[PDB]
Amino acid sequence: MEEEEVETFAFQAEIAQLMSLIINTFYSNKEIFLRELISNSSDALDKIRYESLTDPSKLDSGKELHINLIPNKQDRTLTIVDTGIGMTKADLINNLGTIAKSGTKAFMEALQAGADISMIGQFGVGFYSAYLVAEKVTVITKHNDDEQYAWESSAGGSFTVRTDTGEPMGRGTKVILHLKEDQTEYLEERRIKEIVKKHSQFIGYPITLFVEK
Numbered sequence: 001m002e003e004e005e006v007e008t009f010a011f012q013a014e015i016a017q018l019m020s021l022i023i024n025t026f027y028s029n030k031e032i033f034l035r036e037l038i039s040n041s042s043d044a045l046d047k048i049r050y051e052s053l054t055d056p057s058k059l060d061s062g063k064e065l066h067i068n069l070i071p072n073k074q075d076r077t078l079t080i081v082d083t084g085i086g087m088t089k090a091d092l093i094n095n096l097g098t099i100a101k102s103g104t105k106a107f108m109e110a111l112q113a114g115a116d117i118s119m120i121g122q123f124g125v126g127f128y129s130a131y132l133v134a135e136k137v138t139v140i141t142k143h144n145d146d147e148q149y150a151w152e153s154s155a156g157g158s159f160t161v162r163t164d165t166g167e168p169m170g171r172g173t174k175v176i177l178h179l180k181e182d183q184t185e186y187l188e189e190r191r192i193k194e195i196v197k198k199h200s201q202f203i204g205y206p207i208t209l210f211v212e213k
């Protein structure tokens with residue numbers, strides 16, 4: 001019998017409250033979740049690109065800088081993969097739930113005052129827009145300085161971190177969105193193309209879309 005170690009964490013209370021606002025409030029422009037995730041991937045790709053200017057050995061783990069979009073109707077998942085800088089275990093725990101960075105409180109309060117969801121990325125909490133369309137999010141990441149980890153949350157105030165048992169990545173991050181039953185439009189080629197063309201036209205890395213037969 002295989003034994004796997006899991007670490008469970010509570011979201012920092014303001015992040016939990018922001019997540020509750022995103023999950024329990026209707027917002028009309030939900031499609032921006034994809035812009036936010038592609039933006040995070042592009043930022044991660046910039047970090048490894050700029051670091052590689054003085055240290056080419058940082059690309060030993062992979063020299064291609066790109067993004068893949070993978071919908072899967074059977075699993076009801078939309079996956080965004082990049083070959084960006086990735087996150088170490090510390091980065092993952094620090095940035096994906098235990099610390100409310102400046103932006104979290106300001107945006108949470110802006111949403112409580114009736115603001116739209118559109119500017120979420122400006123407040124540095126764009127990742128959490130995944131919860132407009134997903135009931136569960138899994139983040140797989142690999143940084144040069146560490147092992148491959150899997151973060152996962154179905155909201156409800158908690159998340160888990162474990163060393164990943166899935167397919168290997170040389171370096172980068174994979175965000176797997178387990179879509180809500182009424183948000184399956186985001187598995188459609190036409191809808192994904194619409195959103196990429198509307199919101200991510202100027203992304204400086206190539207995006208490959210895998211279209212299901």
Ligand SMILES: Cc1cc(C)c2cc1C(=O)NCCCNC(=O)CCSc1cc-2nc(N)n1
Binds near residue numbers: 087128
């Ligand atoms: C909340 C959050 C969630 C994810 C999944 C990423 C970044 C952040 C974030 O706001 N980090 C704030 C810190 C700045 N971002 C980084 O340093 C990138 C680490 S790699 C990376 C990180 C993320 N997503 C991808 N695709 N690659």
